[PDB]
Design an enzyme around this catalytic site. Structure first.
Site, short mmCIF file in Angstrom:
data_model
loop_
_atom_site.label_atom_id
_atom_site.label_comp_id
_atom_site.label_asym_id
_atom_site.label_seq_id
_atom_site.Cartn_x
_atom_site.Cartn_y
_atom_site.Cartn_z
N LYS A 143 -4.66 -10.41 0.39
CA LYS A 143 -3.23 -10.32 0.17
C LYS A 143 -2.54 -9.62 1.34
O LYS A 143 -1.52 -10.10 1.82
CB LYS A 143 -2.94 -9.58 -1.15
CG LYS A 143 -1.48 -9.24 -1.42
CD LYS A 143 -1.19 -8.74 -2.83
CE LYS A 143 -2.10 -7.64 -3.27
NZ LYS A 143 -1.65 -7.00 -4.51
N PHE B 108 -5.12 -2.71 -6.71
CA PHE B 108 -4.25 -3.59 -5.93
C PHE B 108 -4.68 -3.57 -4.47
O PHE B 108 -4.78 -4.62 -3.84
CB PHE B 108 -2.77 -3.19 -6.02
CG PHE B 108 -2.13 -3.25 -7.40
CD1 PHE B 108 -2.71 -3.97 -8.44
CD2 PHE B 108 -0.91 -2.62 -7.63
CE1 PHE B 108 -2.11 -4.03 -9.69
CE2 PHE B 108 -0.31 -2.69 -8.88
CZ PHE B 108 -0.91 -3.39 -9.90
N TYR C 116 -2.93 1.36 -8.63
CA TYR C 116 -2.66 1.12 -7.22
C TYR C 116 -3.97 0.86 -6.48
O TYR C 116 -4.01 0.06 -5.55
CB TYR C 116 -1.93 2.29 -6.57
CG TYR C 116 -0.47 2.47 -6.99
CD1 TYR C 116 0.49 1.54 -6.63
CD2 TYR C 116 -0.06 3.59 -7.71
CE1 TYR C 116 1.82 1.70 -6.99
CE2 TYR C 116 1.26 3.76 -8.08
CZ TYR C 116 2.21 2.81 -7.72
OH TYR C 116 3.51 2.97 -8.07
N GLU D 232 10.13 4.33 -2.36
CA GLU D 232 9.29 4.32 -3.55
C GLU D 232 9.91 5.22 -4.61
O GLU D 232 10.24 6.37 -4.33
CB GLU D 232 7.87 4.76 -3.18
CG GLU D 232 6.92 4.84 -4.38
CD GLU D 232 6.86 3.58 -5.22
OE1 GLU D 232 6.39 2.54 -4.71
OE2 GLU D 232 7.30 3.64 -6.39
N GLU E 238 8.48 -8.96 -12.92
CA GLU E 238 8.63 -7.55 -12.61
C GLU E 238 10.04 -7.25 -12.11
O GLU E 238 10.29 -6.17 -11.59
CB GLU E 238 7.60 -7.12 -11.57
CG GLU E 238 6.16 -7.28 -12.04
CD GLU E 238 5.13 -6.65 -11.11
OE1 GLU E 238 5.52 -6.14 -10.04
OE2 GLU E 238 3.93 -6.66 -11.47
N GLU F 269 6.55 -6.01 -2.59
CA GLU F 269 5.36 -6.44 -3.29
C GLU F 269 5.63 -6.36 -4.79
O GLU F 269 4.81 -5.84 -5.55
CB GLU F 269 4.20 -5.55 -2.86
CG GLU F 269 2.81 -6.10 -3.18
CD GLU F 269 1.68 -5.11 -2.93
OE1 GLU F 269 1.95 -3.97 -2.51
OE2 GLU F 269 0.51 -5.50 -3.16
O1 LIG Z 1 -3.38 -9.66 -12.98
C1 LIG Z 1 -3.68 -8.53 -12.62
N1 LIG Z 1 -4.86 -8.23 -12.06
C2 LIG Z 1 -6.03 -9.08 -12.24
C3 LIG Z 1 -7.32 -8.30 -12.33
C4 LIG Z 1 -8.35 -8.54 -11.43
C5 LIG Z 1 -9.54 -7.83 -11.51
C6 LIG Z 1 -9.68 -6.89 -12.50
F1 LIG Z 1 -10.84 -6.20 -12.58
C7 LIG Z 1 -8.69 -6.63 -13.41
C8 LIG Z 1 -7.51 -7.34 -13.32
C9 LIG Z 1 -2.70 -7.36 -12.80
C10 LIG Z 1 -3.02 -6.63 -14.08
C11 LIG Z 1 -4.17 -5.95 -14.48
C12 LIG Z 1 -4.23 -5.37 -15.73
C13 LIG Z 1 -3.14 -5.46 -16.59
C14 LIG Z 1 -2.00 -6.14 -16.21
C15 LIG Z 1 -1.95 -6.72 -14.95
C16 LIG Z 1 -0.86 -7.49 -14.29
O2 LIG Z 1 0.24 -7.77 -14.72
N2 LIG Z 1 -1.33 -7.83 -13.06
C17 LIG Z 1 -0.57 -8.60 -12.09
C18 LIG Z 1 -0.21 -7.83 -10.87
C19 LIG Z 1 -1.02 -7.35 -9.82
C20 LIG Z 1 -0.13 -6.69 -8.91
N3 LIG Z 1 -0.38 -6.05 -7.74
C21 LIG Z 1 0.67 -5.51 -7.09
C22 LIG Z 1 1.98 -5.57 -7.54
C23 LIG Z 1 2.25 -6.22 -8.73
C24 LIG Z 1 1.17 -6.77 -9.41
N4 LIG Z 1 1.08 -7.48 -10.60
C1 LIG Z 2 2.95 -2.17 -5.47
S1 LIG Z 2 3.52 -2.44 -7.14
C2 LIG Z 2 5.31 -2.29 -6.92
C3 LIG Z 2 5.76 -0.94 -6.42
O1 LIG Z 2 7.19 -0.95 -6.24
C4 LIG Z 2 7.75 0.19 -6.86
N1 LIG Z 2 9.11 -0.13 -7.27
C5 LIG Z 2 9.49 -1.04 -8.22
N2 LIG Z 2 10.78 -1.13 -8.37
C6 LIG Z 2 11.30 -0.22 -7.46
C7 LIG Z 2 12.62 0.15 -7.14
N3 LIG Z 2 13.69 -0.36 -7.72
N4 LIG Z 2 12.78 1.09 -6.17
C8 LIG Z 2 11.69 1.60 -5.58
N5 LIG Z 2 10.41 1.33 -5.81
C9 LIG Z 2 10.27 0.40 -6.77
C10 LIG Z 2 6.81 0.52 -8.01
O2 LIG Z 2 6.94 1.87 -8.42
C11 LIG Z 2 5.45 0.23 -7.36
O3 LIG Z 2 4.97 1.34 -6.62
#
Ligand SMILES: O=C(NCc1ccc(F)cc1)[C@@H]1c2ccccc2C(=O)N1Cc1cc2ncccc2[nH]1
Ligand SMILES: CSC[C@H]1O[C@@H](n2cnc3c(N)ncnc32)[C@H](O)[C@@H]1O
Ligand SMILES: O=C(NCc1ccc(F)cc1)[C@@H]1c2ccccc2C(=O)N1Cc1cc2ncccc2[nH]1
Ligand SMILES: CSC[C@H]1O[C@@H](n2cnc3c(N)ncnc32)[C@H](O)[C@@H]1O
Lengths: 625, 625
Positions: free
Chosen positions: A321, A315, A312, A380, A432, A423
């Site tokens: 973003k 992110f 988290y 959440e 996802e 998100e």
């Molecule tokens: O693409 C990714 N991040 C890129 C990154 C950039 C800098 C760095 F040092 C390391 C990784 C992540 C990620 C990291 C590691 C392993 C897997 C993933 C992946 O599925 N991502 C996509 C992603 C980010 C995200 N935010 C919120 C909600 C859903 C999200 N889904």
């Molecule tokens: C910010 S990455 C996406 C966030 O959404 C939450 N999330 C994903 N699916 C669900 C769902 N069905 N209900 C509540 N929170 C969810 C995940 O636990 C994560 O914190």
């Protein structure tokens, strides 16, 4: 700044030679293990029983010097693919001898030439050596951009140079490489030492080498021009090439004598350093991404898994973003609430998947800059994140934010929402299960309610990367299908690759969904016009999302949001590489499939040849509901 | 010098607490994730719907602080093995919650207590957590040397303390550990935090913990005595224990309040530092071996494989070995040549397996200190080493040394030898096929000729090491038998282990061999009297060799050559651990087997229970002829 070596084919004293090379700023030395002219017999008497030592002693350097500073070279007389049976057999024995001595010394790399089409027996002997004993030594295949026959001077009266544009024929040196590494079955120990010529070929011939394992770039002294000062420089054509090569982080080798006699030999290297310093500096993306080049990672599954604190954290470290989310909500509040209803109307916002609460904060900022009243819910499911939310809520937010610890598909809402904010997007948008989650949260949206994001689309593009193919290959694990690794996507910062065609939209989702019998299953056929010869190894995946109206986020290269580094590209591999000729169309088929428990992708290439359907029934990869 | 932590069960402010702990010199802090008294309901209303945050926010520390400086603790109220079904179910849910929060924070370790016999459901919940998601977090099982019931004060009128010597009963806390880790199937994530009591138990009870994965040693403040100055110290009994623990390189945790109120809390740690500095410094062996503790390596095969330069280099770096070879040859020359025949008789020496020529040099030194004439042959099959020999021979030795590039079993000698010298011994003596090689070189020895070495013997000893067993287990590889790793020996510097019985001779070989039909096959039965309870995990192998007369080399612990660090011990594992009670005999059977192509070992335990025969037909491990 730049890692450089020196190629010599004449070393009279190994200790003295190194010192000179080191004094000039070089990091390593490419040199012979046996004297280049010391031809040896292994069958016929009496020359096979030649007495004395066969080469220098290993004692002349330290173990560490051999391990770090010396790159071996195959002797020039060794021709394993000779037509003469005697020379073949002798060169076989000699090649093994030299390679074995290389391993003995513990050399980090060893150079072998690809200077003709047929290198089959060469490949057969190298492959045998690789599968004998244990070593981590690399093998650098010396292969020219332009074949020697194609850059010879037109000075033979009864043999003129080919003045015809031969598209395929000018790419012949890549085919030498391609065949060799195919025979050797894409060994990770075999890489390219690309030899740069005086006259660079056409652009397509160079683009050929995109996505190939180039470890070295050999620069002859002959290709250097001379400036007004009287020191070595390169053309603008070569400059752009070096700039491209510096991105790949290759090691530059200087070969040949000093044609700039009046100057030092360090001048050549000083010029490469000069170029190294004079390049466009890394942006926020390239600075942060530095390290993850072509590193395969499993796609995150925030639904099935509970993300860690530091997942988290990273992110939240993307301000571009959330500023976009802030602006999207800001605009939606102004549209939904007029100026005369500023303090009468309190908008019900619901953050669906609140995490550690970056959106909640953005929703607060958005309402303040808009000057409108809001009532926040923070749904959440991850109970570890809910701990963060509640501590924040008690300390900072207050009763305006109602933290809900539940699944959005389950939660019985005590009030319907005007806006829902989420998100739940990955690298391939819907990877996802954002569709499934927001569909199940749809019921507690007002009939005129808004979803942010309102839409998202995934994109695909065919790529050629012998590096990435070889990387996926290596993800084979015990106790599962031997080819499971090819039937699952990977999040990867694509670096050493070649995008064969422009990205095209794959799957699209709209929220709220108003189509009866909301079906999130999909089937998409894409036709990619390819204008080059190449080897397809997989499909890069990207995505775009519409948060509200004109406020968007995108990782599609051509519409990429500047500065944003939250999402890396996704990669869908294929089991077997596929040849593609110039003019041919790559036709890919993508399915989004589901049952009550799982969602997954299947995919297949149908043109120019058929592949197997990848990941049938989600056998190798599923996304947990 | 020493790695130390602080155990607290009361943290009112997490930021302030760390600062105090860090100021006192501690490296990390063991502390709760939820308030120890904050008991939580998960089934019955209304307490299950308790509002508010369940614990502190992860934001109160940095990600790095959580990752390096904090060790989690299970709450004391959590009892998964309770007799009350409600408390069981609640503690299950709570345990998972706490463990999950530990993973969320990314804690390096987490403490769970073993304070009773039955921890089955505790094990079942932990095992489930380990096989859910991905984490590298360690689990430290808090287990006392002496159970709380056994170190209580004898102050209950109608319940006196057991004044009876119960050998098995005093080892009960090890059985708590043993059962727990067996249930959890020897997870590498599960280790011991050994809690030291005021009264140390008998010696056998402590020896029990030899070869167990002890990562921490918890020291209560109560066990510290006070010196004349008025500062904390330990008894001579505890001092010897800490000295033993410092060899294992564990991390010392201090728990409990400051009973030495007049002094600082750093004083406790300063005493451990004081002990750390005041220990016997590492000898030549322990200095060099430092790093290879319990590191499994494949036994070298110099016959089948050609050794690298840096493999010969490290052999040559053992001056004790070659000084012994020098002295052995020196003595043999004096015995074979009298004073009156000093310059008439030139002795024919033949180094069989010369390598880069350490023996040749020793043979030259030996002849010079003896003042006798010698004629040297240097037979070597490795052609890469022969390059070194010939360069040396041309530069230094001359025509006195005749370098032969051949197998000793093949070579047609132009002269018979008075002495043959060899260095073909491994960690288990005959594991490099020294018998086979010297048998085939025997023909060109004079009828009265000598072999150096003239004899060698291998030794075996039963060991208990849950660490080493778990290490072998992890050597499972794709595309071979799932249990091949248990049917092959390993060269390993044995550290975390317990030798259950004294070494006994296994196989012996004499050169020259004068027994008709020279058979190198063998079968040896050994009976090892064990005087403790334990878990046999394999057999340590050693060897002794007689070079000439009284000149010997040995790696057998009791007759170990001082200073020599060329040979590490060998380890023959067994598939399944075997329980051994005090008084019982471990009976092992060892075979040396061969055909025309290979040599190998088979082995089996026959008492106190039978094992499977390991490595039948050399299926898992062969030594190439
Ligand atoms: O693409 C990714 N991040 C890129 C990154 C950039 C800098 C760095 F040092 C390391 C990784 C992540 C990620 C990291 C590691 C392993 C897997 C993933 C992946 O599925 N991502 C996509 C992603 C980010 C995200 N935010 C919120 C909600 C859903 C999200 N889904
Ligand atoms: C910010 S990455 C996406 C966030 O959404 C939450 N999330 C994903 N699916 C669900 C769902 N069905 N209900 C509540 N929170 C969810 C995940 O636990 C994560 O914190
Ligand atoms: O036990 C061993 N050496 C111990 C050691 C000490 C310090 C160090 F830094 C690393 C290793 C070697 C060895 C090393 C590595 C991997 C395997 C082995 C092995 O079978 N050995 C035994 C051995 C030594 C030797 N010398 C001559 C002829 C035959 C020989 N057989
Ligand atoms: C010093 S380690 C043992 C040495 O003996 C050599 N050796 C082993 N077996 C033979 C053999 N049969 N003939 C000759 N050299 C041998 C090995 O190549 C190595 O250099």
């Amino acid at each position: 700044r730049v890692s450089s070596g020196r190629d010599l084919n004449c070393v009279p004293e190994i200790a003295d030679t190194l010192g000179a090379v080191a004094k000039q700023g070089f990091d390593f030395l490419c040199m012979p293990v046996f004297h280049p002219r010391f031809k040896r017999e292994f069958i016929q008497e009496p020359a096979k029983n030649r007495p004395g030592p066969q080469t220098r002693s290993d004692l002349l350097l330290s173990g560490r010097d051999w391990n770090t500073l010396i790159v071996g070279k195959l002797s020039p007389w060794i021709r394993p693919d000779s037509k003469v049976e005697k020379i073949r057999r002798n060169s076989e024995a000699a090649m093994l001898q030299e390679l074995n001595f290389g391993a003995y010394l513990g050399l980090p790399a060893f150079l072998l030439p690809l200077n003709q089409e047929d290198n089959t027996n060469l490949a057969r002997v190298l492959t045998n050596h690789i599968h004998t004993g244990h070593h981590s030594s690399m093998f650098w295949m010396r292969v020219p951009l332009v074949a020697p026959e194609d850059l010879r001077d037109d000075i033979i009266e009864n043999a003129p140079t080919t003045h015809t544009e031969e598209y395929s024929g000018e790419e012949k040196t890549w085919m030498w490489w391609h065949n060799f590494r195919t025979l050797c079955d894409y060994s990770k120990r075999i890489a390219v030492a690309l030899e740069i010529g005086a006259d660079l070929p056409s652009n397509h011939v160079i683009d050929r080498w995109l996505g190939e394992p180039i470890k070295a770039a050999i620069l002859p002294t002959s290709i250097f021009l001379t400036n007004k000062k009287g020191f070595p420089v390169l053309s603008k054509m070569h400059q752009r090439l070096i700039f491209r090569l510096l991105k790949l982080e290759v090691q530059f080798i200087i070969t040949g004598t000093n044609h700039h006699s009046e100057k030092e030999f360090c001048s050549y290297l000083q010029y490469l350093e000069y170029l190294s310093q004079n390049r466009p500096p890394p942006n926020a993306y390239e600075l942060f991404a530095k390290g993850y080049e072509d590193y395969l990672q499993s796609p995150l599954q925030p639904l099935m898994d509970n993300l860690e604190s530091q997942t988290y954290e990273v992110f939240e470290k993307d301000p571009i973003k959330y500023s976009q989310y802030q602006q999207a909500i800001y605009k939606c509040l102004l549209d939904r609430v007029p100026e005369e209803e500023k303090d009468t109307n309190v908008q019900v916002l619901m953050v669906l998947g609140a995490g550690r609460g970056p959106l909640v904060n953005a929703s607060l900022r958005a309402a303040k800059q808009a000057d409108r009243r809001i009532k926040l819910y923070a749904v959440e499911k991850n109970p570890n994140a809910v701990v963060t939310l509640e501590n924040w809520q008690f300390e900072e937010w207050g009763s305006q934010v109602t933290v809900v610890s539940s699944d959005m598909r389950e939660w019985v809402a005590p009030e319907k929402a005007d806006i829902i904010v989420s998100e739940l997007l990955g690298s391939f948008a819907d990877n996802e299960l954002s569709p499934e989650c927001l569909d199940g949260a749809q019921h507690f949206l007002k009939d005129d309610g808004v979803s942010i994001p309102g839409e998202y689309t995934s994109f695909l593009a065919p790529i050629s990367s012998s590096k990435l193919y070889n990387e996926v290959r290596a993800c084979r694990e015990k106790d599962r299908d031997p080819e499971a690794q090819f039937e699952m996507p990977y999040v990867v910062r694509l670096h050493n690759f070649h995008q064969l065609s422009a990205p095209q939209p794959c799957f699209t989702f709209s929220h709220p969904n108003r189509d009866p019998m909301i079906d999130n299953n999909r089937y998409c056929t894409l036709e990619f016009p390819v204008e080059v010869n190449t080897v397809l190894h997989g499909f890069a995946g990207y995505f775009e999302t519409v948060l509200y109206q004109d406020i968007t986020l995108s990782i599609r290269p051509e519409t990429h949001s500047p500065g944003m580094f939250s999402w890396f590209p996704i990669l869908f591999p294929i089991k077997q590489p596929i040849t593609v000729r110039e003019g041919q169309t790559i036709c890919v088929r993508f399915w989004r499939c589901s049952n009550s428990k799982k969602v997954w992708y299947e995919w297949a290439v149908t043109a120019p040849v058929c592949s197997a359907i990848h990941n049938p029934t989600g056998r190798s990869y599923t996304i947990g509901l």
